[PDB]
Design a protein around this ligand. Structure first.
Ligand SMILES: [Mn+2]
Length: 664
RNA sequence: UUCC
């Protein structure tokens, strides 16, 4: 299957990915880096008192609150779905090495017995119907840009004025670039408009990962995370090795003189990709309108906000199945990319725009530093984009691509195993569209609520119900994958978008409730993914702008957890043992300081008005903008708060851009 | 130095 071409940083093809400015040049050369994160102002993640705190808190909570998950993966009782040892990592120090991204996932999919295209005409009609329902009758809106985000290849600018110019210039020259691409002139498109080149691979921390305590040895064991070396990555797995990264932290003592307590490990690192902003801008200009459409018209299956918002839907079901998808982004099929482009062309979308979109899902990737003495290599040839990495995280519409794939995959699962009587409803495009439009509004006996690779599938009373139970049973047995498209299983400890579905003795959706995940509160408060970046003066540009504000939304977010009170008290007690101070007081102080500092960023609130007008979501997002990247959408945040985190491009300009893209 |  052809190895992918690879070029060292020194090669002209890689050099061309970095503009002649210090930032870009430094991004190209950055070597492996690690170090303790500043968990909170003045507190490092490896501070002896903090690790002592984590040791005691994790053992105590695990021992006193064992998981309550039944044989079908439904959590009940204490609402706990696992041990609490996940907090035992030296945050800021990664597992070595991180993985090289797979240049082609075709073999990976084939070996996993996944299909290389819609397996039946019905499936082909549904995937295409999804494209028609999602990309039709879109309303333009201004292109919003995250403050402080990098434009990556080739400029690596973080300056909002520069980003706005890049975005406006891109919406203006997109057509010309796309047509150049239609002519096979990728180098031209890239050199003239910076549309193309590659994704810049950045390795991010998944701060908490599974750890178990071996009753026999009394030693802790970290979950092995398999990583691919360069050979494996460029040959799509045909050669090279797939092996377990080392999470052993002993090295930190010898290397940095850091004391490492027993049972503390290095963090799991995941690949993330920064897209070339000039190419992403014209894609984002279409993506937001699509989100606005599916979150409004198809709100039932796609717009999720609070625990109660989700609860109201699942309540009406007779059966709720919490699914789980294995490695969604790397398994995502390039044929769906081509199917989507093809259908957009049929709907009348501008060819040059579709070309831009298709190319963004075939782009080469530049690998920075997976480990010491490794990296700085471009995978793929920018002159002719042909990678099959699956779904690139920094592409302008990754969320939509995952949602489109999975939503139809789940529907097909329901049709295949429970509702054959609904197949006659899907005879052609018009009927497929009508059926999908109704299914997505929650009007059929089979339903779902989903977002990318997270979802809950439902069956009301009816003919499909009996099949629903058979499907659930098949998932429990876990011997046969219920889908030809992705590896699907049931989630151990069913949850949807952060909220655990707590069942009572009846184990039925009608008497079940969504509660926050208490473990996530712990991950967020004691294992953040980033330090506080106290050296970045503009807080709005930090990964964690106002960390202290989360204390004010805690009760609203986790109050419904059965053991909420208990955890807060175990924390207070353990923090006292470790620091000789009150954690609560410590947090109230951080809350006060950040509340005072927030007024400096929000025109709305007076030079000291409280948080009175802000919602729980507003607060969680100010403390962790990332949640606006996987949990909520712009519309869920008060407008004056959204302005703090994002800046937009003129409405007139995106409006003019959209008009030229969409169907006449 | 990404992406509702
Ligand atoms: Mn789930």
């Amino acid at each position: 299957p052809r190895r992918a071409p690879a070029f060292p940083l020194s090669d002209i093809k890689a050099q061309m990915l970095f503009a002649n400015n210090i930032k870009a040049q430094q991004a190209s050369k950055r070597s492996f880096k690690e170090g303790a994160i500043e968990t909170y102002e003045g507190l490092l993640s490896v501070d002896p008192r903090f690790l002592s705190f984590k040791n005691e808190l994790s053992r105590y909570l695990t021992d006193h609150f064992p998981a309550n998950v039944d044989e079908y993966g439904r959590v009940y009782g204490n609402g706990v779905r696992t041990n609490f040892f996940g907090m035992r990592h030296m945050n800021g120090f990664p597992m070595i090495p991180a993985t090289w991204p797979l240049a082609s996932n075709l073999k990976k999919r084939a070996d996993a017995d996944l299909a290389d295209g819609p397996v039946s005409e019905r499936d082909n009609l549904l995937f295409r119907a999804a494209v028609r329902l999602m990309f039709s009758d879109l309303e333009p809106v201004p292109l919003k840009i995250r403050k402080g985000s990098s434009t990556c290849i080739p400029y690596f600018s973080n300056d909002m004025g520069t980003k706005i110019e890049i975005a406006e210039r891109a919406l203006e020259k997109a057509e010309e670039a796309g047509n150049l691409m239609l002519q096979g002139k990728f180098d031209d498109a890239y050199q003239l408009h910076q549309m193309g080149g590659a994704y810049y691979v950045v390795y991010r921390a998944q701060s908490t990962d599974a750890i178990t305590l071996d009753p026999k040895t009394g030693k802790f064991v970290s979950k092995d995370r398999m990583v691919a070396d360069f050979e494996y990555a460029v040959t799509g797995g045909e050669q090279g090795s797939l092996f377990a990264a080392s999470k052993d932290a002993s090295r930190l003592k010898e290397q940095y003189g850091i004391d490492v307590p027993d049972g503390f490990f290095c963090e799991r690192r995941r690949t993330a990709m920064g897209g070339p902003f000039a190419l992403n801008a014209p894609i984002m200009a279409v993506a937001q309108p699509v989100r606005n459409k599916i979150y409004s018209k198809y709100a039932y299956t796609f717009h999720h906000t609070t625990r109660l918002n989700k609860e109201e839907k699942v309540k009406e079901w007779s059966l709720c199945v919490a699914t789980d998808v294995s490695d969604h982004d790397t398994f995502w099929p390039g044929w769906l990319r081509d199917l989507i482009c093809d259908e957009l062309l049929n709907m009348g979308y501008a060819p040059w725009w579709v070309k831009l979109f298709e190319t963004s899902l075939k782009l080469p990737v530049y690998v920075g530093a997976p480990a010491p003495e490794q990296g700085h290599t471009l995978l793929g040839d920018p002159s002719n984009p042909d990678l099959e990495v699956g779904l690139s995280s920094g592409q302008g519409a990754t969320d939509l691509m995952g949602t489109l794939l999975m939503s139809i995959t789940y529907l097909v699962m329901q049709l295949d195993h429970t509702a054959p009587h609904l197949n006659s409803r899907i005879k052609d495009m018009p009927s497929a569209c009508r059926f999908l439009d109704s299914y997505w509004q929650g009007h059929e006996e089979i339903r779902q609520i989903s977002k990318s690779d997270d979802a809950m599938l439902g069956w009301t009373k009816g003919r499909a119900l009996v099949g629903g139970h058979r499907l659930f049973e098949m998932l429990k047995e876990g011997k046969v994958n219920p889908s030809p498209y992705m590896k699907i299983s049931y989630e151990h400890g069913g949850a949807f978008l952060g909220d655990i579905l707590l069942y009572d003795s009846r184990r039925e959706p009608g008497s079940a409730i969504f509660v926050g995940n208490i473990n996530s509160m712990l991950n967020n408060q004691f294992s953040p993914e980033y330090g506080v970046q106290s050296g970045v003066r503009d807080r709005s540009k930090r990964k964690r702008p106002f960390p202290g504000l989360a204390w004010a939304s805690m009760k609203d977010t986790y109050g419904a957890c059965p053991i909420y009170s208990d955890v807060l008290e175990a924390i207070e007690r353990c923090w006292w043992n470790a620091f000789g101070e009150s954690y609560r007081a410590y947090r109230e102080d951080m809350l006060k300081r950040d509340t005072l500092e927030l007024s400096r960023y929000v025109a709305s609130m007076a030079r000291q008005a409280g948080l009175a007008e802000l919602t729980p979501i507003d607060l969680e997002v100010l403390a962790d903008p990332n949640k606006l990247q996987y949990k909520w959408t712009e519309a869920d945040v008060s407008a004056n708060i959204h302005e703090v985190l994002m800046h937009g491009v003129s409405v007139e300009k995106t409006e003019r851009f959209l008009r030229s893209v969409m169907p006449r």
